[PDB]
Design a protein around this ligand. Structure first.
Ligand SMILES: C/C(=C\c1ccc(C(=O)O)cc1)c1ccc2c(c1)C(C)(C)CCC2(C)C
Lengths: 11, 240
């Protein structure tokens, strides 16, 4: 999982 | 001295130039600064330098994500694809970025906050056995005299690559890259009408970056064994 990148991309 | 009109690409070119400049300060417009850390001889790893280097690396990865989100159409891709593309090209873009801040006179490289390290320090900060390779790449890049527009376009082309594995919409990615490829070619002829070979020369640099980034992944494993704590999380995810 990429919780950081997800988050940065979603917002 | 004359060129056909290409308003659309010109526009895209302008947006990419701005995305790069806003997400990555220029070498000239910045106050350089040094440090005396292990600046003379090489060591397995200088933790002080590593601390600063891994911090700047984390921040630049964040800048690259921002850059990606500023590329027309990028956010139109699935989140999965956005992550896949960023993970596949991040290190390549990171290497290109630092190499465009190479100062051959003093044999140093300058980070986004102005930190300027010589070859020995870059080695000691974490580049290790990849140091000479990277400097060689930066030295061979200078002759191309690329500006922020060409650098941003190259980064965008590297990122928006439909050949990456596990894309949900590879074609959609290819569609996005074409305009970028076209824009780079035209812009290159704009600056150099005599060097009709500069386009393929610059494109080739992407493959060159790959040879170094592929090795960078191995450097991550070695670094994990040298540092006391965990690899900064974002770096983990990107090279994961
Ligand atoms: C080239 C790089 C990082 C970098 C580029 C630009 C800035 C800036 O501030 O402008 C900061 C950092 C980099 C990042 C991570 C790694 C490497 C280089 C090597 C090639 C040494 C392999 C191992 C890891 C830690 C993944």
């Amino acid at each position: 999982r990429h919780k950081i990148l997800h988050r940065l991309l979603q917002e | 001295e004359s060129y056909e009109m290409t308003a659309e690409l010109d526009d895209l070119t302008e947006k990419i130039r701005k995305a790069h400049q806003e997400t990555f300060p220029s070498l000239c417009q910045l106050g350089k600064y040094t440090t005396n850390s292990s600046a003379d001889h090489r060591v397995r790893l200088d933790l002080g330098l590593w601390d600063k280097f891994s911090e700047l690396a984390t921040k630049c990865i964040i800048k690259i994500v921002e850059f990606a989100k500023r590329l027309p159409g990028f956010t139109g891709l699935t989140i999965a694809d956005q992550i896949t593309l960023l993970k596949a090209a991040c290190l390549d873009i990171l290497i290109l970025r630092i190499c465009t801040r190479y100062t051959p006179e003093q044999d140093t490289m300058t980070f986004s906050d102005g930190l300027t390290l010589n070859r020995t320090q870059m080695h000691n900060a974490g580049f290790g056995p990849l140091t000479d390779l990277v400097f060689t790449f930066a030295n061979q890049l200078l002759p191309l005299e690329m500006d922020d527009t060409e650098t941003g376009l190259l980064s965008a082309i590297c990122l928006i690559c439909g050949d990456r594995q596990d894309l949900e919409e590879p074609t959609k990615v290819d569609k996005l890259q074409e305009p970028l490829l076209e824009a780079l070619k035209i812009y290159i002829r704009k600056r150099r009408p005599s060097k009709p070979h500069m386009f393929p020369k610059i494109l080739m640099k992407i493959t060159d970056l790959r040879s170094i980034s592929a090795k960078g992944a191995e450097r991550v494993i070695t670094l994990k064994m040298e540092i006391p704590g965990s690899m900064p999380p974002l770096i983990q995810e990107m090279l994961e």
